[PDB]
Ligand binder design. Structure first.
Ligand SMILES: *[C@@H]1O[C@H](CO)[C@@H](O)[C@H](O)[C@H]1NC(C)=O
Lengths: 54, 172
């Protein structure tokens, strides 16, 4: 795929307030650069090809 | 309908009654005429608007839910997701069918009812001065001019004024 026979597998970890992340590796780590801020609310996702009007 | 007035002892509706749902037609010494009954018309209309507003009130608001279409076969978890959705849809579809069936039966019966109530109220005003001809018409046994007819229509008819005349015509 795009020249490549190798792959990256993606994982995720959520860390709550007062907890801590530890990353321990001796090779093959694709490291995070930071974190995404989690929110709760009314957001969602939908698959559609419909145009978006005003 | 349950009351047997509409499509009953009232043989048919009036396409020419265009200013109301229920009303009166008369023939007297001054000619013939027609008038809508406002109270009965509005009672039926008010009930129907009541049930309509109860039905079209408050759709539910839902946001993030479960996926309902899938591009790969997955087995057990997808099976369950699809079954949950199908089950939900069949239940709501049943609710919709039943809701309109019950509401509509009841709408027919309540309008039939309003027709019957107007008929009974008129009969009661007339006391011994009229007889029910059985087709939703009263034969009034005294001279009853346009103002008299209007007194019946507006609920102020005074039967005692006409009682001697009417009884003489009915029974002798
Ligand atoms: C009822 O009709 C009579 C006769 O037309 C009229 O005199 C009277 O004003 C009416 N009453 C009402 C409450 O409108």
């Amino acid at each position: 795929v795009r020249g490549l026979s190798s792959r990256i597998s993606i994982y995720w970890t959520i860390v709550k307030p007062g907890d801590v992340l530890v990353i321990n590796s001796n090779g093959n780590l694709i490291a995070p650069r930071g974190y995404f801020k989690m929110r709760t609310g009314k957001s969602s996702i939908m698959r559609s090809d419909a145009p978006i009007d005003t | 309908g349950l009351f047997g007035a509409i499509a009953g002892f009232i043989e048919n509706g009036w396409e020419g009654m265009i200013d109301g749902w229920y009303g009166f037609r008369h023939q007297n010494s001054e000619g013939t005429g027609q008038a809508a009954d406002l109270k009965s018309t509005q009672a039926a209309i008010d009930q129907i608007n009541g049930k309509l507003n109860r039905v079209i009130e408050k759709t539910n608001e839902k946001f993030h839910q479960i996926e309902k279409e899938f591009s790969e076969v997955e087995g057990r978890i997808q099976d369950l997701e699809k079954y949950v959705e199908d089950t939900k849809i069949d239940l709501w579809s049943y609710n919709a069918e039943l809701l309109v069936a019950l509401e509509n039966q009841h709408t027919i019966d309540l309008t039939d009812s309003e027709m019957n109530k107007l008929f009974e109220k008129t009969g009661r005003q007339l006391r011994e001065n009229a007889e029910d001809m059985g087709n939703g018409c009263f034969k009034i046994y005294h001279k009853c001019d346009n103002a008299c007819i209007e007194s019946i229509r507006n609920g102020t008819y005074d039967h005692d004024v006409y009682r001697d005349e009417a009884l003489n015509n009915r029974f002798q």
